[PDB]
Amino acid sequence: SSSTPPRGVTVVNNFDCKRYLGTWYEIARFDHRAERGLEKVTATYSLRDDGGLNVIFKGYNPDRGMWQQYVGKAYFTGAPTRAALKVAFFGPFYGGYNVIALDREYRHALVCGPDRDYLWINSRTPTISDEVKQEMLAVATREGFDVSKFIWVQQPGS
């Protein structure tokens, strides 16, 4: 089931959706065809009339010589105080989106998909401290993700 969280993963359960809105830089990702080779990736989150979120993915594609966007819609699968969502880019075809770690300042987030082949480190800044990087890798490995799969995404100052 590609719209539920991975078995045996803790999801953030005191989620304040309003503080999560705005722009997040992608620090690291497990690669798949949608993202592979994209640089300087951000995700931008905004509230919709219908209680879902707009998710605008932006990345630089060196082979095409262009910036490209993916326009999606995210909805909470349960209460909006549990950071368990599902995202679609076309039609009723959803993937799981789960915030599994978040600092009290809503400045750094570990986000996974519906299984352990999907994981992202995200930051309000394009670079993170070695201390924040270490905590992210510790949380991910404790939840059973193979962090050797990370691609460290090209960002200004990386």
Numbering used by the authors: 20 to 177
Which sentences did the original study use to describe this structure?
Later, proteins capable of binding and increasing the fluorescent signals of fluorogenic molecules became commonly referred to as fluorogen activating proteins (FAPs). It suggests that the easier task of fine-tuning the fluorogen-binding properties of an already functional protein in silico should be readily achievable.
The resulting protein, designated DiB-RM, performs better than its parental variant both in vitro (except for the dissociation constant) and as a tag for protein-PAINT with higher brightness, localization precision, and apparent photostability. We speculate that the observed decrease in affinity to the ligand is caused by introducing two aromatic amino acids in the protein’s binding pocket (76F and 89Y). While the presence of these amino acids is most likely responsible for the observed increased brightness of the DiB-RM:M739 complex compared to the parental DiB1:M739 through the better protein:ligand interface packing, in the absence of the ligand these bulky amino acids might partially hinder the entrance of the ligand in the binding pocket. Crystallization analysis of DiB-RM in the apo form in different conditions further confirmed the already known high flexibility of the E/F lipocalin loop that was not properly addressed during our computational redesign. (C) The side and the top views on the overlay of the DiB1 complex (shown in yellow) with the DiB-RM apo structure (shown in light gray). The side chains of the amino acids in the positions that differ between DiB1 and DiB-RM as well as M739 are shown as sticks. Interestingly, in both cases, the 50 top-scored structures contained a mixture of different ligand positions one of which was matching the chromophore position in DiB1 while the other was very close to our original docked pose. This observation together with our inability to obtain the DiB-RM:M739 co-crystal structure might indicate that we have stabilized an alternative binding site for the ligand by the introduced mutations but have not destroyed the other one. As a result, the ligand in DiB-RM might have multiple possible binding positions. This can also explain the larger apparent dissociation constant of this new complex.
